[PDB]
């Protein structure tokens, strides 16, 4: 029940800093512009130990299973190939992406209805709103 609440289909509604961020975290010009136009729908579930998220947009399709605390490797939707670990702290999924000596961690939050991410790059944060489907 560790992620009870997270579980469903969620459609992004808003978006601060985003082109900001992935130029902080290194993608070229098109992806940026591109990437940027999405309206994803991020869909979260969970059987046994297992969390699935995927992110279905017209841009690109990703999907990660993982167990919490367990490290894996991903490669983004931007291309970059990341070692990545995924944990539960207050009721936070914190998502830490880790490569070429880099770092950014995305985090994942339940207010009110909406599910908040927020993502960090150095001093550069993205606030991204996601509603239910
Ligand atoms: C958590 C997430 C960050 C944001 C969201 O799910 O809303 C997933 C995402 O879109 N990643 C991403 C995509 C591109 Cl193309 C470039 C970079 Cl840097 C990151």
């Known amino acids: 029940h560790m992620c009870d609440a997270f579980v469903g289909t ?33 869909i979260i579930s969970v059987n046994g130990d297992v969390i699935t998220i995927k992110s279905e947009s017209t841009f690109k399709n990703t999907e990660i299973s993982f167990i919490l605390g367990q490290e894996f490797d991903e490669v983004t939707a ?33 207010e009110d209805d909406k599910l908040v991410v927020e993502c960090v790059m150095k001093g550069v944060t993205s606030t991204r709103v996601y509603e239910r489907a």
């Open 78 to 110: 931007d291309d970059r190939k990341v070692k990545s670990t995924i944990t539960l702290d207050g009721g936070v999924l914190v998502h830490v992406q880790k490569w070429d000596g880099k770092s950014t961690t995305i985090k994942r939050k339940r």
């Open 10 to 42: 969620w459609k992004l509604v808003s978006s601060e800093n985003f082109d900001d961020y992935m130029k902080e975290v290194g993608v070229g010009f098109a992806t940026r512009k591109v990437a940027g136009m999405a309206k994803p729908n991020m």
